[PDB]
Amino acid sequence: KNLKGIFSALLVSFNADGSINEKGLRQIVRYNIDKMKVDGLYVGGSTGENFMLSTEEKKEIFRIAKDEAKDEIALIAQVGSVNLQEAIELGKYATELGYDSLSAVTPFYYKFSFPEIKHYYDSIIEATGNYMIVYSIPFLTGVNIGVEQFGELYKNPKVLGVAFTAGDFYLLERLKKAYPNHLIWAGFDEMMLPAASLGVDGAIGSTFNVNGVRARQIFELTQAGKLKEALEIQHVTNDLIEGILANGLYLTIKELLKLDGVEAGYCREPMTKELSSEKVAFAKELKAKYLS
Amino acid sequence: KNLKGIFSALLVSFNADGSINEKGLRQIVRYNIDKMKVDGLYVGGSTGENFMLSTEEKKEIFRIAKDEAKDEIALIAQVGSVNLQEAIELGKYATELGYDSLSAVTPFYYKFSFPEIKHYYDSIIEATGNYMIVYSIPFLTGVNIGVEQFGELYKNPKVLGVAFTAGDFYLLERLKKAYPNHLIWAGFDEMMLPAASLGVDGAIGSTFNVNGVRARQIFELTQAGKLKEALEIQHVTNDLIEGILANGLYLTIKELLKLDGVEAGYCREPMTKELSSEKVAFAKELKAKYLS
Amino acid sequence: KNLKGIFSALLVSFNADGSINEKGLRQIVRYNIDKMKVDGLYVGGSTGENFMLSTEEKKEIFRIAKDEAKDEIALIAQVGSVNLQEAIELGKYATELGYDSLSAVTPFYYKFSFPEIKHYYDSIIEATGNYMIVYSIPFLTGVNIGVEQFGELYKNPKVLGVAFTAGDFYLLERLKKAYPNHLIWAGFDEMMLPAASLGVDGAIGSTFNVNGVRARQIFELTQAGKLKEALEIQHVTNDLIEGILANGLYLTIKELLKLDGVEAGYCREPMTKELSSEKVAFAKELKAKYLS
Amino acid sequence: KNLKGIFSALLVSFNADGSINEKGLRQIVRYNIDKMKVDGLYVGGSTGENFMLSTEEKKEIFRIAKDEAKDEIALIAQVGSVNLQEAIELGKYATELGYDSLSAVTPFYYKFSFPEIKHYYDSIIEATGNYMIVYSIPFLTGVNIGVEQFGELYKNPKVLGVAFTAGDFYLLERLKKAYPNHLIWAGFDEMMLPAASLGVDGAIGSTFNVNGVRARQIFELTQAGKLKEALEIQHVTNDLIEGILANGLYLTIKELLKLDGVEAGYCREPMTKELSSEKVAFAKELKAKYLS
Ligand SMILES: CC(=O)N[C@@H]([C@@H](O)[C@H](O)[C@H](O)CO)[C@@H](O)CC(=O)C(=O)O
């Protein structure tokens, strides 16, 4: 499949006790495919609360997402972990499920050297035989990969490019300049327009599973050169995103899904599991102003 | 005058002993006006080696720049300093010289509170009666001003906006959204295109006093919606800028001015005063590839 | 048991394939008890490569260490995780093994609020009924808990104090002023003397695996006010630690164990699994100079 | 003179208009010598609000302090600046006054290379013929010099050691190991005990202006190995310092001086020039609790 364009970073529905709610998770997937009209899903990312889950849970989410989506859309499986043996086990499972590409966060917590980082990517690829997308998220991992280092990663022909949840647009431009055949997916939804202006190939975003219509319009208008209109739509989206961030990101996207009848459920502990009354009321105001 | 568009951050020619070379400084000003075709000059900024100079030297530079440029172009005088009494003295002098606006760096070194910062801006404005442009450069000062704080600064009607040498494009978009009548000048030349895509009103840049032709083309093509062409010109400019940064920023821009017959002189100690042979040869290669 | 004094952060022996080497792990435990004469072991900390391992592997390590040590020394089980359900499962298992206290890293990766972090500690305690030591390691997690926040955690009376792998000695002194009955274990071996001078109750350290004799001397001499002699031993200790850090921290402590007959094995991928030959020779030099 | 021991970082008395109050500055100097019984004064440091002042004002302060103190105590002149020609002019003037050593902050604001920083120290020394103390204050300048780099500075035999306003006690111990004949003055008053335990040669501190008696006791008791008694005095000291930091550091030390009859005056804009009335009462509480 084509891996360009708009990918929601899939949110997962949890029950009160923190178990996966399969019915809810399917409604989320269905909603992204049918109503947000995404090109694909990025499953197991930070937005899916992935790092708070067990390996078996992560497998269940991969299985459920793929069974619901089938081949209607492109699917990318984020399998990265500080535990390389887990990342390999997950990448094999996702590959056998038919995921179109793997993705892996740079290994974190410990301060890994660049050679260790590369060996981690190469090891997942060798064990799975699947494509790989580097998942770069410096504001969470503390890891900053430079132009020449991405090029060493790109010496492995199964590495397709980078899910770039980073805000350095000089680095962004330089990666496009040096590796014009490798892909970049912008990761910060509130900076989609300036990333689109630099020729990114698509975007992966949490807010796309409620705002995926505007997200597509910004992306398409910008790359068609209609910046005045793309900018307008970016301004309204950033009103919504500022609202969502203030109110509590994952819970608030989930609340916005609930207001459209998607049983998007609780967040997983240790995240706060549920919005207070006041925050529910604020999310309803966001819905009325921006998504109704 | 109109303060929109392309402003070179003026470089200053020094002699071997660190004194200002007036003939050189005039040739720099002349070159920006006549060959780079800038809309204005930003005098006394970080690029002018301002923070390594005495108050009397800074005054001489203001006097010389204004006497050479006259009213051919817009002139902005950066007068900020950890010493508020110096900043007031400089802002008065620049105002009496006819500078179109003042600008001041956020006070630095000490960790000033936001109220102290605002009192500094308001004090300069009250003493001078001139317009003020906030000079925000977090990667040097460590000071990060937020949307609501810019709005408190903008309660003073003589504050025109911000010289934004910062790379947070979410903040950038938010400032345009909240204060659509206040101006923003992008400060990172290697990120001009994505800043132009968000509707900045112009740019202040060191590299414009050798690359001000391409800088204008990126700015105009982007805001006319021709992103494919603006992107191309941004890629070549960033090859040049990457070169310049690797070789030594201020010295290398000065070397590029010398290759066009501008006596751009030495840098001021404690900066390295002169390029080595090897670095001169590299700057000549930059000239041959990008500016000939 | 008395939980004061010298605790080695237990290293784990791995096979070439990343699996646990039980014989090797047992010999490490024995070497600590019998040769390093430690007061206890801190098991499953960052030093034990814990965050690269499966839930089952962590349990296996808890089981082995307890089996070897029996009740000859104190044992603390680090059970913290970004996965709260994992932390609870591990905390219950270590509690059933008869671990003298649990400990848990502040939840990391995601940017959790202080209420969420407190809820995480309280939930582990509620589920296990065991003592809890907060594991604070800001340079790996980016989380910095302040004096008032420690006080809120200390409202739970099963919270004993803090494994303070942190370098702020004003915070350290302030915690002892505020909470004089709560314990502190210093976590930077190379700053043992100044931490001991502030009246910490013990220390938890990776290098105590090989240098536990000097570590006890620094600690005991410092608390007796014999600073001249403590400082001497700290200088030699720090020559060794500087060499260990330059050569590769966990690999080099393992090599130093191997040089004494202990089957300390490989590191676990994605860490580099073995030293280069050059670095093996360097560990031999350290052994000859500092440990023979 | 012997440059070891307890040095207050001299505060400066300002008038309402920001000018120097000579009578007030003289009374501060006298209070230090006569009541705080300091070994010396560190004049023109960050504590003296130096970086907010003109060249002439700095000279006036050097002149006054020397005039009052004569040879009753040691005197060190902080003459560092981003302006090297300024540092040289000040260094020559303080040397002509008979200052026992110069000192200079690492050049800041710009991102200077280590060679440029060394050239700056060497140039000041060459121009003045006086001793030099490196002033290291990473939390204000962002500059962190490492052990090998200190060694390169120490190749100049007029470099005596370092005013270490820094909190890394591994670096501290490593500097004493490597350069045992070079001096270190600890610069964080609230970490005096652990610094003294590592064998620093003295301390330079703003709070010594009002708490010099306890500061000498902590320092002397620590070096005698009377840690229990040193720690007590450090706890009380740190109750006072925590209150001073919460209330506004330089203003509150000035208020505490005023409460003893010393005309310590205002702070200099852009610092807040005087305490709110509420905070004046709070300084009175500190005085009653800690200093009467
Ligand atoms: C950490 C995070 O949530 N990042 C989001 C963003 O879409 C982000 O939520 C949004 O731009 C607001 O910050 C995307 O990059 C997708 C992603 O990294 C993920 O799977 O979490």
Ligand SMILES: CC(=O)N[C@@H]([C@@H](O)[C@H](O)[C@H](O)CO)[C@@H](O)CC(=O)C(=O)O
């Ligand atoms: C610190 C600095 O040089 N900034 C330049 C940039 O133009 C910069 O030189 C360029 O983008 C490369 O980093 C501009 O922001 C202008 C400026 O701040 C200045 O006066 O120095």
Ligand SMILES: CC(=O)N[C@@H]([C@@H](O)[C@H](O)[C@H](O)CO)[C@@H](O)CC(=O)C(=O)O
């Ligand atoms: C991160 C780490 O390894 N820290 C060690 C230290 O002993 C450290 O290895 C030593 O001070 C060298 O920096 C201890 O704090 C124990 C600990 O946190 C651990 O199990 O990792």
Ligand SMILES: CC(=O)N[C@@H]([C@@H](O)[C@H](O)[C@H](O)CO)[C@@H](O)CC(=O)C(=O)O
């Ligand atoms: C930045 C500052 O004020 N530092 C003081 C300290 O004494 C400090 O005020 C005190 O430890 C409270 O943090 C000393 O290091 C002396 C010094 O650097 C100075 O003159 O500012």
Ligand SMILES: [Cl-]
């Ligand atoms: Cl970032």
Ligand SMILES: [Cl-]
């Ligand atoms: Cl390519």
Ligand SMILES: [Cl-]
């Ligand atoms: Cl920035």
Ligand SMILES: [Cl-]
């Ligand atoms: Cl406005």
Ligand SMILES: [Cl-]
């Ligand atoms: Cl207590």
Ligand SMILES: [Cl-]
């Ligand atoms: Cl020495």
